[PDB]
Design a protein around this ligand. Structure first.
Ligand SMILES: *[C@@H]1O[C@H](CO)[C@@H](O[C@@H]2O[C@H](CO)[C@@H](O[C@@H]3O[C@H](CO)[C@@H](O[C@@H]4O[C@H](CO)[C@@H](O)[C@H](O)[C@H]4NC(C)=O)[C@H](O)[C@H]3NC(C)=O)[C@H](O)[C@H]2NC(C)=O)[C@H](O)[C@H]1NC(C)=O
Ligand SMILES: *[C@@H]1O[C@H](CO)[C@@H](O[C@@H]2O[C@H](CO)[C@@H](O[C@@H]3O[C@H](CO)[C@@H](O)[C@H](O)[C@H]3NC(C)=O)[C@H](O)[C@H]2NC(C)=O)[C@H](O)[C@H]1NC(C)=O
Ligand SMILES: *[C@@H]1O[C@H](CO)[C@@H](O[C@@H]2O[C@H](CO)[C@@H](O)[C@H](O)[C@H]2NC(C)=O)[C@H](O)[C@H]1NC(C)=O
Ligand SMILES: *[C@@H]1O[C@H](CO)[C@@H](O[C@@H]2O[C@H](CO)[C@@H](O)[C@H](O)[C@H]2NC(C)=O)[C@H](O)[C@H]1NC(C)=O
Ligand SMILES: *[C@@H]1O[C@H](CO)[C@@H](O[C@@H]2O[C@H](CO)[C@@H](O)[C@H](O)[C@H]2NC(C)=O)[C@H](O)[C@H]1NC(C)=O
Ligand code: NAG
Ligand code: CA
Ligand code: CA
Lengths: 948, 48, 96, 48
């Protein structure tokens, strides 16, 4: 059995045949010389993290203050215009004119628009008027609707006025409390249509305040049958009217009150918790007798907890019963004598039981009474409780006219991830002489204006930062308004099983890897205090395959106007960047000559990053034609750059020649090398090149350099990086592509570190194998692995066929045992935005758990004994010097015919984490400081059952 | 209180209280759709 | 019992599913003689429970006696006749 | 089939339902030689 000395000696001759080849074929030292040879075509500039955040935060504040002025202008006019309405009841003669959307009329006349297609808008829109959306379950032409369609016609002038001042304005919509929504600009509405403006997340937050809701469900015997099905559906539809700022819990009672789920107290009612409550509600049975005294005492006790995090706001109890005889007068006097809790009572089902006590409990406690006799009445009755909650808000006056911003959600008109402003509109008719005050305690509606996140991304440029640097903003709840990992997909819960209304609320600790320091940083941004911190963490790569440890510098400041906090993740070696300063014409024209598509025969195949170089230039998302447009534009235009930035073009043009000089001076000397298949260079400017043009068809990497997985991993590692190919016929990558190597160039201009590009070569697997023979033995096993346990080449003629595959899926016995020796650490994370094929009860959103592996200890000489049971298999492991590779040699599997369960490193569809215990120690959060409830002037003299 | 097994509709010819039971017995006595009431009573105790 | 036993057990579901096509199901032909369910996508096979949930059928002596007693009182005899017209052929059930 | 329908009505099974189904506003089968364009014509008030 070979000793450790001879194995290290054989390894020393192994990496020296790879490092030297990569150091010479790629020309990493030649590119360093080229950058340092000139030192005058560009200039190094400081990248102060503190300056950037205070500047980017101000720009976001100004953008969100331009939108607030548009809401105040709209809300003020609607209150003024509505007060001058007459409420006529005959529209046959003087019909109202409007454009009803979702169409191809007793008292209305339609409008046929022109609908020119527009940029920054996925649909055909018209700015001449405003469209109107009337839900299917509401009949247009009723007296209420037509009256609302007349006085709202004065908003179209204000719609045009706002768009004149700020042409980059998205949908402006007025959500009427009567159901109809009028939005601008007019665009046709997008199966049946179930849209209702009053149930939208942006409407609900402006119609009321956060609430400490609690639901009482009658599960006594008399509710068995149809009326239990209605009760379960009504509870489910009522949970859909709660947001992340509202706290809910569901309890039942049948001769004994108990919780229906695992929570036992109020929870945040986010997307994950509502899914648990809905499952618990949908699994209840009716049995026993009714006791209202016992049920209400339980409800009042959970609203007095105060050990747990709540909203400290509207406290409401909703009773889902059918009928009864007990009034529970003693319970109400004992618990709420001062009417601090509102009680909303529902009479669900078709029955003839006594509704007297149910109606009495409602208005004796500042509540309201609702009837749900059929399925069609569920949706309209579970959303009408926001009129009662909005009574104290209208009595506040101007103190309640504050602009709020929702969570990130997918737009209902196919626009992407957006956020919406919000401002309620009051009914102030007859308020001049102050005598009516009868129906003047209900809001007219809610105004909203959309701010796309792509608009936010334009205010935080990232091209002067390294590919490892980025911006991110955090909501007071903790969710990320802006983040690289945030994707335009709904966040999933559980596992889909079959026999986009919810917001995309991604927590900060879920977007990236969780850490003890990052928890403290997250808390410091929530409570709005600026600061900075540098520290060392381990960073997941672009793909879920590798983890590398690096240094980062988190700088955060709060946005003054809003409640958001903006942070900048600027790594080391990124505080300085190259600023191109070229002014001479012929020295700029020659650089552009290399980008001609017909010049690839001597400069190599060339890609260019589809950045927003100039406004009239348009991206094509394929780069087959984008390169044609780019180089036929710069010549077909004056070099003064009249309407587009020279900074983003001077970088790409200067880097065009810096890589160009490498090809002829060093790469062209070696036309072909024995062990090298392709040579590539990727540059911060946004260009990549491949010298062998016939091998340029195998470049599947994204043209945008900032999104390249290998680029970001190479900057962090001081040594060379080996990237394993994909498996299971994931395109051509097995033998015709090769093994990728990378090494980021490092330059020192004036003692400052810069990493402007990465260079590498594709190692030929066929020639690499010949370095082991210089084979297929049944006595000993030899494999090579990278940082992450992926096979790169072997000597068994079956291992090499399964190339680029995780070691745990081909030899779990040694792989599982290796982790115990602490050679390979690992971290498990959940991906809340991922689609997977549903299991037995298309694709649906689901949570997938990802794991990655990395080197744990810095020591290289590893040895041990693998005891699979009733036998043994000695092994020795050596890590290649100055390379992320590890060489491990073990006795062949023929001696020990054992095979444990394979250790899979892939996206495992999991339902975790369990939320029954996250509520016990919830993440820190800060609630809204506004609270509009319990106004003494509130009327609440209408029970709701007196008129029903 | 045993005809609550459909969960999709409410039956009118039941035995929930005395007037309704009396009406149901009268209807069976006249022989009009007594088979429907018999089927409901059979399903109320399991099934076929 | 002798003439027709277990023949009202074949309605038309959808394509490779356990969900019946129409909300008022009626049996198909037993051997290509009775009603044929011809819709957009519909093939009919066994496994159905029965017309009245399994209460009205002739696949047992108790079931046959109950069905005969129901028919002898002139209450719902046409329903059974039509169900047998759908399931079995068209010429025998009217005589019975 | 007409005689069977009359026997069913004599038994009194759903005779009023057929009577309602025989009112004028009924669709005609696409086999009678009716005037093109109009097909909801067969049926008469004689049914009652
Ligand atoms: C803002 O608040 C003002 C008041 O503060 C409110 O204006 C009031 O509107 C109502 C109609 O909704 C007017 O009522 C008048 O008198 C009776 C009673 O409502 C109506 O007669 C019937 O009323 C029932 C009520 O449900 C209705 O269903 C029915 O269709 C009516 N007609 C019948 C049965 O034939 C009158 O029709 C109605 N109008 C008249 C007499 O012209 C109040 O008089 C209005 N108050 C004031 C001071 O003008 C206004 O709607 C609120 N804003 C919004 C957007 O709702
Ligand atoms: C609610 O509906 C009402 C019925 O149409 C509207 O009231 C009508 O508005 C018309 C448009 O201005 C008026 O016509 C002209 O109005 C101007 C303004 O003072 C004047 O030139 C004349 O009064 C009039 N010209 C004529 C009649 O030749 C109607 O007079 C007016 N009243 C009616 C038709 O009874 C309301 O405007 C509408 N509410 C809103 C907010 O638009
Ligand atoms: C938000 O506003 C606060 C105060 O209004 C700003 O705080 C300033 O902080 C600097 C140093 O950090 C001080 O020199 C100033 O005197 C402070 N301002 C005031 C008015 O005292 C903060 O900079 C603002 N943030 C942004 C992003 O604009
Ligand atoms: C938290 O709620 C508990 C009951 O749910 C309150 O009662 C106390 O519970 C803790 C836990 O053992 C102990 O202090 C005593 O057993 C209880 N009484 C007192 C007077 O503490 C408790 O008061 C609530 N608040 C806190 C801070 O525990
Ligand atoms: C991610 O992986 C790291 C590295 O394996 C783990 O953190 C280690 O935790 C143990 C105790 O639980 C400590 O002894 C180690 O020092 C930690 N490693 C460090 C700090 O590098 C853990 O599995 C994950 N880290 C988390 C969840 O924070
Ligand atoms: C909009 O915001 C910008 C800053 O982002 C500000 O300069 C401008 O005055 C605002 N208003 C308009 C109409 O552009
Ligand atoms: Ca009861
Ligand atoms: Ca009858």
């Amino acid at each position: 059995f070979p000793s450790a000395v001879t194995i290290k000696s054989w390894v020393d001759k192994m990496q020296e045949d790879l490092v030297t080849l990569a150091k010479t074929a790629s020309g990493v030292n030649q590119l360093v010389d080229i950058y340092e040879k000139y030192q005058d075509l560009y200039t190094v500039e400081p990248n102060n993290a503190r300056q950037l955040v205070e500047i980017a935060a101000r720009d976001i504040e100004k953008l969100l203050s331009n939108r607030s002025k548009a809401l105040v202008r709209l809300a003020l006019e609607a209150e003024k215009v509505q007060a001058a309405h007459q409420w006529r009841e005959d529209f046959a003669s003087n019909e109202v004119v409007y454009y009803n959307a979702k169409d191809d009329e007793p008292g209305s006349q339609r409008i046929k628009p022109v609908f020119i297609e527009d940029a920054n808008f996925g649909r055909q829109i018209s700015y001449q008027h405003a469209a109107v959306h009337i839900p299917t379950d509401i009949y247009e032409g009723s007296t209420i609707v037509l009256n609302e369609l007349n006085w709202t016609s004065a908003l179209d002038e204000v719609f045009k006025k706002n768009r004149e001042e700020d042409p980059s304005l998205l949908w402006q919509v007025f959500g009427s409390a009567t159901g109809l929504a009028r939005y601008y600009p007019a665009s046709p509405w997008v199966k049946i249509d179930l849209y209702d403006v009053r149930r939208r997340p942006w409407y609900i937050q402006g119609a009321a305040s956060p609430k400490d809701m609690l639901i009482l469900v009658d599960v006594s015997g008399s509710v068995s049958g149809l009326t239990l099905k209605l009760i379960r559906t009504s509870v489910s539809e009522m949970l859909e009217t709660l947001s992340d700022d509202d706290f809910v819990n569901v309890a039942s009672f049948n001769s004994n009150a108990q919780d229906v789920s695992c929570f036992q107290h109020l929870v945040q009612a986010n997307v994950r918790n509502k899914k648990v409550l809905k499952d618990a509600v949908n699994n209840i049975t009716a049995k026993g007798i009714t006791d209202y005294k016992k049920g209400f005492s339980f409800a009042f006790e959970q609203l007095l907890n105060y050990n747990v995090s709540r909203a400290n706001c509207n406290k409401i109890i909703m009773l889902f019963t059918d009928g009864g005889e007990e009034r529970a007068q003693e319970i109400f006097n004992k618990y709420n004598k001062d009417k601090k809790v509102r009680v909303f009572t529902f009479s669900v089902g078709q029955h003839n039981y006594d509704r007297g006590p149910i109606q009495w409990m409602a208005c004796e406690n500042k509540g309201y009474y609702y009837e749900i006799p059929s399925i069609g009445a569920i949706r309209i009755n579970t959303q009408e409780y926001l009129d009662v909650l909005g009574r104290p808000m209208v009595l506040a006056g101007d103190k309640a006219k504050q602009v709020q911003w929702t969570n990130v959600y997918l737009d209902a008109l196919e626009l992407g991830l957006v956020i919406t402003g919000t401002l309620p509109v009051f009914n102030i008719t007859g308020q001049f002489e102050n005598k009516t005050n009868l129906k003047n305690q209900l809001i007219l509606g809610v105004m909203g204006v959309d701010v796309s996140l792509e608009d936010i991304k334009r205010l935080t440029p990232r091209f002067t930062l390294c590919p490892n640097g980025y911006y991110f903003a955090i909501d007071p709840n903790g969710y990320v308004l802006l983040h690289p990992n945030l994707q335009p997909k709904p966040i999933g819960v559980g596992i889909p099983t079959i026999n986009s209304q919810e917001p995309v609320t991604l927590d900060f600790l879920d977007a990236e890897l969780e850490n003890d320091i990052k928890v403290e940083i997250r808390n410091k941004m929530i409570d709005g205090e600026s600061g900075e911190k540098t520290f060392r963490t381990l960073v997941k790569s672009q793909d879920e395959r590798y983890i590398d440890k690096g240094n980062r510098t988190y700088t955060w400041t709060p946005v003054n106007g809003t409640d958001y906090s903006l942070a900048l993740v600027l790594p080391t070696y990124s505080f300085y960047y190259i600023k191109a300063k070229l002014e001479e014409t012929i020295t700029q024209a020659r650089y552009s000559e290399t980008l001609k598509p017909d010049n690839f025969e001597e400069s190599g195949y060339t890609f260019i990053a589809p950045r927003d170089y100039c406004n009239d230039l348009k991206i094509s998302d394929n780069n087959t034609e984008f390169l044609l447009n780019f180089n036929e534009f710069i010549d077909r235009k004056t070099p003064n750059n009249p309407s587009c930035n020279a900074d983003l073009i001077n970088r790409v043009l200067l880097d065009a020649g810096f890589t160009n000089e490498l090809v002829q001076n060093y790469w062209s000397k070696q036309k072909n090398i024995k062990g090298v298949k392709a040579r590539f260079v990727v540059t911060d400017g946004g260009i990549t090149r491949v010298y062998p043009k016939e091998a340029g068809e195998n470049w599947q990497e994204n043209p945008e350099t900032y999104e390249d997985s290998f680029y970001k991993r190479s900057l962090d590692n001081d040594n060379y990086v080996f990237t394993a190919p994909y498996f299971n016929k994931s395109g051509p990558g097995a033998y015709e592509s090769g093994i990728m190597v990378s090494k980021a160039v490092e330059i020192y201009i004036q003692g400052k570190l810069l990493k402007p590009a990465v260079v590498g070569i594709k190692i030929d697997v066929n020639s690499w194998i010949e370095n082991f023979t210089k084979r297929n033995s049944d006595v000993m096993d030899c494999v090579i692995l990278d940082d992450g346990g992926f096979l790169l080449m072997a000597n068994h003629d079956d291992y090499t066929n399964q190339i680029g595959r995780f070691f745990g899926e081909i030899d779990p016995s040694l792989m599982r045992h290796l982790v115990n020796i602490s050679v390979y650490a690992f971290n498990k994370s959940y991906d809340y935005q991922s689609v997977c094929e549903p299991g037995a009860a298309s694709k649906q959103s689901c949570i997938t758990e990802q794991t990655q592996y990395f080197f744990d200890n810095d020591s290289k000489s590893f040895s041990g004994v693998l005891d699979c049971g009733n036998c043994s298999r000695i092994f020795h492991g050596e890590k290649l010097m100055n390379t992320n590779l590890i060489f491990i040699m073990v006795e062949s599997k023929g001696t020990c015919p054992c095979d444990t369960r394979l250790l899979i490193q892939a996206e495992q569809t999991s339902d975790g984490p369990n939320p029954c215990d996250m509520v016990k120690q919830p993440r820190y959060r800060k609630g809204p400081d506004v609270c509009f409830d319990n106004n003494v002037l509130e009327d609440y003299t209408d029970c709701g059952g007196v008129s029903g | 209180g045993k005809f609550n097994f459909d969960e999709t509709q409410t039956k009118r010819s039941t035995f929930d209280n005395f007037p309704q039971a009396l009406l149901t017995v009268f209807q069976i006595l006249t022989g009009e759709d007594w088979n429907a009431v018999m089927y409901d009573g059979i399903m109320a105790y399991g099934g076929p | 019992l002798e003439l027709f036993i277990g023949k009202m057990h074949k309605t038309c579901f959808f394509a490779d599913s356990d969900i019946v096509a129409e909300e008022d199901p009626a049996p198909c032909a037993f051997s290509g003689n009775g009603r044929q369910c011809t819709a957009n996508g519909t093939e009919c096979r066994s496994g159905w429970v029965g017309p009245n949930g399994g209460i009205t059928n002739f696949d047992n002596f108790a079931f046959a006696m109950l069905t005969v007693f129901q028919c002898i009182t002139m209450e719902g005899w046409t329903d059974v006749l039509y169900w047998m017209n759908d399931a079995m052929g068209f010429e025998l059930p009217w005589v019975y | 089939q007409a005689v069977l329908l009359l026997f069913r009505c004599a038994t009194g099974e759903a005779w009023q339902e057929i009577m309602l189904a025989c009112l004028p506003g009924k669709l005609c089968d696409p086999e009678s030689d009716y005037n093109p364009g109009e097909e909801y014509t067969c049926g008469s008030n004689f049914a009652i």
